[PDB]
């Protein structure tokens, strides 16, 4: 985006003062839309010396004479050319500025506009900038942040020692990674993206996007009326163990609930019988095992079952021991079908095997599993989209790195999913998602498309739960899926 | 306003490119508000070489990539600096311009943006500018005019040979006289006034205004609970004749319906009895006359009746003959009370008498009566606010010059009323208004305030008629008045 500001100025010829004005007045219209008529409020605008503060000066000037009271507190040491220009205008229009912050100055205002730091935040907020932000966070006033809540790193969504907690954030052109990833997404409050005059070609040239309803609607496969089971594809799920008899059922219904024609489960006997007692629409093939877990002795049976299907999901409830490790790795090495790889299949995976496969793969790790898979700490991999990108690119796969915001990348294209709620923070929830992905690949979506549609609908089904989210279980989620799909259209 | 553009640039320091941008995007938001989502439409923007065309270029650029299609037809010979700058941007953003107009080019577009001439129209539109405007007026497309419909003189509201008929006009800062006066008010369609960054002090420094609901609400007199008849004042109406027995009744109820405590009519016998048979709340004093008209023999009786009142209305239905002329002029010369002067009192008035009076006066002529009063043609006086201003100033009065838009001036302050409809275009309608004015002066409003409130409520009562306006009569209007007043608050 800083690159897109530059090109719109330097190559397209838009005066930077014009971009600055459009930004400021965007903030005013966005506040009007949220608060209704602005004339009864008193505004405290906090302005740094950079262009974010310049945007604030523009905001402050456009409230002059229209609202109860305005006051700019200027916190910077020096002003950029556009901030100076706009400070010059605020003052000529009759605006009050001060350069001293008093703890009790919040008492006299209803709304605080936070235009201290934007995308030009480098390093940690200390000193009076911090005291001021802490004071605003304590005040209970309505906070509107310009571009990004000051103190959010707009590339990572990390808090640089302290950050403003906004009720509304108005950003320009496109959402920034820091609005989308946590903790920054939490501090952004309600996000509005204002068009401030950038040519549409540049806005679209951005290469990381949020997954939207319109995008998932345009990727949903067609259901032509003259169709049969086979039109909508076949999936094999290799899953479960004597410890984890539940996973296969949730995965298998994940696939069916998204419109797959046939799902075959391969689960050790007698645990295979669990699935068909819940959902007799499933096929649940008993695999004979020595101790209740898959091993190399089941390799040939499973490649055979894989001949008649379009995609294979593997991992949920398999268990993690040396015999499962041999079996999964020999299996994926030999399977010449798209693989969706989850849970324990990820925990025992040899990444050399992903390289040597001609057929595609989606991996769906949570950050715990990602940490173990690349031999890093959870904190190093969590919300790390560049690492996810290198992993996908180096291993020729799609990586779906699950969290409150999920990253879906293939190494070139990176998408962020923001649907969902904390009800997905319990067991079985990932098992549903593995199914949904496998099912959509079976219906002819590519691995990346399959993954994009699935994370979105998975999250959206959670939001449709009618009672409190914390009571949501994977079984209820399965029921909500077709509602999520209906509501897409 | 041209003066206000200059001051905001030259003294306040707002770059003229910034005013130009804010104007253009105002037009886009205004169209969005009227048409809903703009993305399904195809836009034909017609651009002159002046700043109005520059505003159009800004509009055209901000639709690029968002709507189905845009095309600018450039009609000018040369471009001003800001028009050139913005043309430069349209072209760099990928916009199609052409400089040739083909009659059938309208076929390919849904909306025409008219940015040919604004306030810089000098003289008549001839040639291809005219052919183009005629073609647009024939097309049945939706037309949005920038600032003023091209071909309206923004100072008079006159049509300079031909003019664009708009569905929506978006103007900047304040309404211009040409939006408010006819025929321009008819060609403006729905008018939106956009704030484009002018300091509020300058916007308010404008000295001709439209009368608004908020202004009439703040002028409506108080009704303190501990009040009696006399609190709300007394009015005498000198009116009627054996030819025109109806006028006194409509005037008298005009006064009462606006909250006056007492109305006394003085009407030649037996026509005085007409009023109390309609409305027995009135007092209708029989005046003994020789031939059914007031004359000097009724002078003393009428000055006596005037001693106990606060304001005197005179004129409706008096008749116009030499005896009425002597009587009215001797009367007003001697009356030391505010006078509201209407109809036949205006037709026989000696203007030397208005000069020599210490007490104030409102005159309420229609353009016929104004023409006769200043000895000019109807066409010279109609919608001529400067003439009205000199008359008020030279004769120390308030002039209410009635028409579809009514001008109310005292020589310093000029207000335009735009409420009403064609149902007020029939006899009796002016007689109600005379009463309303007299009544409001009686309640303590100044002559100018009285007149401003009255023209607004008179017009607004007409709009509240429940059936077709053409069937509205003065009697129904009297009934609607207190509803108009209720709806003010």
């Amino acid at each position: 985006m800083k690159e897109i500001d530059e090109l719109t100025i330097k190559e397209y010829g838009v005066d930077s003062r014009i971009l600055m004005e459009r930004a400021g007045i965007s903030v005013v219209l966005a506040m009007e839309e949220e608060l209704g008529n602005l004339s009864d409020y008193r505004f405290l605008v906090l302005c740094g010396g950079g262009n974010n503060g310049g945007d604030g000066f523009v905001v402050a000037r456009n409230l002059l004479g229209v609202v109860k009271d305005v006051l700019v507190v200027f916190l910077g040491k020096k002003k950029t050319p556009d901030c100076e220009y706009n400070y010059g205008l605020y003052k000529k229009f009759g605006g009050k500025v001060v350069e001293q912050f008093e703890p009790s100055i919040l008492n006299e205002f209803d709304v605080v506009v936070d235009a201290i730091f934007g995308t030009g935040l480098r390093g940690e907020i200390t000193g009076e900038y911090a005291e001021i932000i802490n004071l605003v966070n304590k005040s209970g006033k309505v906070v509107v942040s310009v571009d990004v809540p000051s103190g959010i790193d707009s590339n990572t969504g990390k808090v640089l020692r302290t950050a403003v907690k906004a009720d509304l954030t108005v950003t320009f052109g496109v959402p920034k990674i820091g609005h989308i990833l946590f903790p920054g997404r939490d501090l952004t409050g309600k996000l509005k993206v204002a068009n401030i005059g950038h040519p549409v070609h540049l806005i679209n040239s951005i290469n990381r996007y949020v997954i939207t309803r319109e995008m998932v609607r345009s990727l949903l496969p067609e259901r032509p009326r003259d169709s049969h089971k086979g039109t909508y594809g076949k999936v094999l799920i290799i899953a479960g163990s004597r410890l984890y008899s539940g996973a296969p059922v949730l995965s298998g219904m994940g696939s069916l609930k998204v419109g797959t024609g046939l799902v075959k489960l391969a689960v050790p006997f007698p645990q295979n019988l669990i699935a068909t007692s819940r959902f007799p629409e499933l096929i649940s093939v008993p695999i004979d095992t020595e101790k209740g877990f898959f091993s190399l002795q089941n390799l040939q049976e499973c490649l055979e079952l894989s001949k008649d299907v379009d995609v294979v999901a593997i991992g949920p409830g398999l268990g993690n021991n040396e015999h499962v490790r041999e079996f999964v790795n020999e299996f994926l090495k030999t399977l010449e079908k798209p693989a969706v790889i989850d849970a324990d299949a990820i925990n025992v995976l040899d990444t050399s095997v992903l390289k040597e496969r001609k057929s595609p793969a989606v991996l769906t790790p949570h950050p715990g599993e990602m940490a173990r898979l690349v031999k890093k700490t959870v904190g190093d991999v969590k919300y790390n989209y560049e690492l996810a990108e290198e992993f996908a690119k180096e291993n020729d796969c799609v990586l779906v790195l699950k969290s409150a915001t999920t990253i879906v990348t293939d190494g070139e294209k990176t998408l962020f999913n923001i649907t969902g709620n904390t009800g997905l923070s319990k067991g079985g929830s990932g098992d549903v998602l593995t199914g949904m992905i496998a099912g959509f690949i079976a219906q002819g979506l590519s691995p990346l498309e399959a993954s994009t549609v699935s994370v979105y609908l998975h999250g959206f089904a959670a939001e449709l739960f009618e009672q409190d989210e914390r009571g949501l279980t994977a079984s209820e989620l399965l029921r909500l899926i077709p509602e999520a799909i209906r509501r897409l259209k | 306003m041209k003066e206000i553009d200059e001051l905001t640039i030259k003294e306040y320091g707002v770059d003229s490119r910034i005013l130009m941008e804010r104007a253009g995007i105002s037009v886009v938001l205004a169209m969005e508000e009227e048409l809903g989502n703009l993305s399904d439409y195809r836009f034909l923007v017609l651009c002159g070489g002046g700043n109005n065309g520059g505003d159009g270029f800004v509009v055209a650029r901000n639709l690029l990539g968002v709507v189905k299609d845009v095309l600018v037809v450039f009609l000018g010979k040369k471009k001003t600096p800001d028009c050139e700058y913005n043309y430069g941007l349209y072209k760099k953003f990928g916009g199609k311009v052409v400089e040739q107009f083909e009659p059938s080019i309208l076929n390919e577009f849904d909306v025409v943006v008219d940015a040919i001439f604004g306030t810089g129209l000098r003289g008549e539109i001839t040639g291809e500018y005219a052919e183009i405007i005629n073609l647009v007026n024939k097309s049945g497309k939706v037309v949005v005019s920038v600032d003023v419909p091209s071909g309206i003189d923004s100072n008079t509201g006159k049509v300079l040979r031909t003019a664009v008929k708009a569905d929506l006009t978006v103007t900047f800062g304040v309404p211009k006289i040409g939006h408010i006066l006819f025929p321009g008010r008819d060609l403006t369609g729905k008018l939106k006034v956009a704030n484009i960054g002018h300091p509020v002090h300058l916007i308010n420094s404008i000295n001709r205004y439209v009368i608004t609901r908020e202004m009439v609400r703040s002028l409506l007199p108080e009704r303190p609970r501990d009040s009696h008849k006399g609190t709300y004042g007394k009015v005498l109406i000198i009116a009627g004749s054996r030819l025109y027995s109806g006028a006194p009744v409509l005037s008298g109820m005009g006064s009462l319906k606006v909250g006056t405590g007492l109305v006394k009519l003085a009407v030649p016998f037996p026509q005085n009895l007409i009023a109390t048979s309609r409305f027995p709340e009135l007092i209708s004093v029989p005046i003994d006359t020789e031939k059914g008209f007031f004359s000097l023999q009724n002078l003393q009786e009428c000055l006596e009746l005037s001693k106990d009142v606060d304001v005197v209305a005179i004129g409706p239905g008096l008749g116009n003959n030499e005896h009425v002329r002597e009587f009215v002029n001797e009367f007003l010369k001697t009356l030391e009370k505010p006078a509201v002067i209407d109809a036949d009192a205006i037709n026989v008035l000696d203007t030397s008498v208005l000069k020599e009076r210490k007490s104030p006066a409102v005159l309420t002529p229609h353009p016929g009566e104004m023409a006769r009063l200043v000895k000019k043609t109807v066409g010279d006086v109609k919608y001529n606010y400067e003439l009205a201003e000199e008359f008020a100033k030279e004769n120390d009065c308030v002039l209410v010059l009635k028409s579809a838009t009514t001008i109310v001036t005292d020589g310093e302050k000029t207000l335009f009323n735009i409420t009403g409809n064609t149902g007020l275009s029939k006899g009796g309608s002016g007689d109600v208004l005379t009463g309303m004015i007299a009544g409001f002066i009686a309640q303590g409003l100044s002559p100018l305030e009285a007149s401003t409130v009255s023209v607004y409520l008179h017009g607004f009562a007409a709009e509240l008629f429940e059936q077709d306006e053409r069937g509205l009569t003065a009697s129904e209007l009297l009934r609607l008045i207190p509803e108009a007043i209720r709806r003010l608050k």
Partner: peptide, 6 residues
Amino acid sequence: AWLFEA
């Protein structure tokens, strides 16, 4: 739609 994406 023209000014804001929500």
